Enzyme design. Sequence first.
Site, PDB file in Angstrom:
ATOM      1  N   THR A 146       0.928  -1.255  -0.115  1.00 41.72           N
ATOM      2  CA  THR A 146       0.076   0.006  -0.028  1.00 41.72           C
ATOM      3  C   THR A 146       1.009   1.255  -0.161  1.00 41.72           C
ATOM      4  O   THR A 146       2.065   1.239   0.409  1.00 41.72           O
ATOM      5  CB  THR A 146      -0.974   0.114   1.333  1.00 41.72           C
ATOM      6  OG1 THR A 146      -0.222   0.026   2.576  1.00 41.72           O
ATOM      7  CG2 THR A 146      -2.052  -1.127   1.107  1.00 41.72           C
ATOM      8  N   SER A 147       0.501   2.374  -0.522  1.00 37.11           N
ATOM      9  CA  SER A 147       0.930   3.752  -0.199  1.00 37.11           C
ATOM     10  C   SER A 147       0.933   4.072   1.199  1.00 37.11           C
ATOM     11  O   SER A 147       0.187   3.782   2.014  1.00 37.11           O
ATOM     12  CB  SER A 147      -0.093   4.715  -1.233  1.00 37.11           C
ATOM     13  OG  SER A 147       0.039   4.673  -2.343  1.00 37.11           O
ATOM     14  N   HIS A 164       7.849   0.099   4.161  1.00 34.47           N
ATOM     15  CA  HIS A 164       7.265  -1.120   4.741  1.00 34.47           C
ATOM     16  C   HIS A 164       8.505  -1.731   5.247  1.00 34.47           C
ATOM     17  O   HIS A 164       9.664  -1.580   4.951  1.00 34.47           O
ATOM     18  CB  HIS A 164       6.515  -1.873   3.595  1.00 34.47           C
ATOM     19  CG  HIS A 164       5.359  -1.263   3.399  1.00 34.47           C
ATOM     20  ND1 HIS A 164       4.050  -1.145   4.004  1.00 34.47           N
ATOM     21  CD2 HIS A 164       4.761  -0.597   2.006  1.00 34.47           C
ATOM     22  CE1 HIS A 164       2.935  -0.703   3.533  1.00 34.47           C
ATOM     23  NE2 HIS A 164       3.499  -0.235   2.318  1.00 34.47           N
ATOM     24  N   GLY A 165       8.260  -2.773   5.974  1.00 36.78           N
ATOM     25  CA  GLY A 165       9.308  -3.804   6.514  1.00 36.78           C
ATOM     26  C   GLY A 165       8.683  -4.889   7.114  1.00 36.78           C
ATOM     27  O   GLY A 165       7.626  -5.250   7.485  1.00 36.78           O
ATOM     28  N   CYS A 169       7.716  -1.719   9.780  1.00 33.40           N
ATOM     29  CA  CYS A 169       7.186  -2.953  10.440  1.00 33.40           C
ATOM     30  C   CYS A 169       8.403  -3.827  10.670  1.00 33.40           C
ATOM     31  O   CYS A 169       9.382  -3.718   9.969  1.00 33.40           O
ATOM     32  CB  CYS A 169       6.129  -3.583   9.701  1.00 33.40           C
ATOM     33  SG  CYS A 169       4.535  -2.471  10.214  1.00 33.40           S
TER      34      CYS A 169
END
Lengths: 240, 240, 4, 4
Positions: free
Chosen positions: B34-35, B93-94, B135
């Site tokens: 997602t953005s 993100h992660g 994350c």
Amino acid sequence: SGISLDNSYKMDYPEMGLCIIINNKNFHKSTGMTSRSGTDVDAANLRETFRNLKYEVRNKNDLTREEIVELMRDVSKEDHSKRSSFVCVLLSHGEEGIIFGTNGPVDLKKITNFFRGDRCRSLTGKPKLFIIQACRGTELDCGIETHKIPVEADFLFAYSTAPGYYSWRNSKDGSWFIQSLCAMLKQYADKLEFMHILTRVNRKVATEFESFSFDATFHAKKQIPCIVSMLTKELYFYHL
Amino acid sequence: SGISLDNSYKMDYPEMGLCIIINNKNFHKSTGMTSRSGTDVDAANLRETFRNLKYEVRNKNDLTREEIVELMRDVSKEDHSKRSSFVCVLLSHGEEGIIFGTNGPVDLKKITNFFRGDRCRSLTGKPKLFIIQACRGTELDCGIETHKIPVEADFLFAYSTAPGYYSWRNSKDGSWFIQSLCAMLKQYADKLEFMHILTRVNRKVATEFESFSFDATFHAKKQIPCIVSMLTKELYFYHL
Amino acid sequence: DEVD
Amino acid sequence: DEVD
């Protein structure tokens, strides 16, 4: 009264708290794990160091994985209302996220979960310190020539070595990390905040130690400990 | 001269150093990610905060995994001789040990390796700071009602969230961690040592934020950041 | 010197 | 509020 500040943990409860030391030296043959020569030096140093910080120290030697779990369960079920903090020292073999009982591994997560803010209420909002002398992998450092609070909050992990790396123990002097940790607690506990003490420990280990081995693979290696803090306040072992 | 002390990093080189900010907001469709609404707020806050600490800030937006790697390689190959320190901010993100380029993941280890004491010599012995809003897993915190130096030394990882846990970002205010980090740097950088600043950040995040979601699974959750230090000295952003 |  |  005058204005107040909320930057430091309250460490003036009737008791400092428990210091649980789990000293695993001899392992079941079936595990294929070696004896941890020198660990008794570490256990003895730790006992004395935390004794002078006024912790109620309990040493336990050579515990099985089942015994470790039940000890931690039981300790988490004690009434810690009159205690400022909790300390647990683990001295054993390990891998990332794992420590060894005499007969096999225990997930570090299983151990710390007993003390989660929601699962041990007399320690909620109090510093829970986990000091761990154990490998976190098999990498060697070649060095270079010069609703309310989170259940995971208020934990501190003082690891002996970086993620993924071996941790070094000397069979005669004890482990590099525990040696240095006790020395710095002895010298600075009445002076520095705990993170600043742990930083002195990082530098002592990083600068003053280097392995000697007849085996080229394990010779001339270095070590850096790893402080992991989810504390929400400064921690001084002394008070007014 | 008079007696000297070696407890604090030398932060009075001609330059404070680089602050590299990698702001990943828009991801390739194929990734299914997602953005990251609100991340520009974070990038802008970070730029200003580190600008006032006198860091040479470089913002890079929406980098592929290949672009992240080559940027870090190139930055590690610059001459940092006149710089006191290095800072890298990752916003993406992660998962545990992983951050995402626009088109896929990069191992955090690959990124930090470029700056190892033996691989980036003009940063050897200097603080290398990695600040990571991403994350580290999918756990949610329900909270509770109240030869010489190691190549891995002199790194600091300021993680937004605990190991294994989601990290929270607000699409309008920006992420909880970056919001709080900038606020505390603004207020205390001319006063406190960096670990003490990061501890104020832990408490701000832990106490002042709680998620609101129409989805019960993600509602009323809490977050605690995670300071991981292999520093060997105290770090103050100011000097004499 | 030994490893844990 | 969203997760990363």
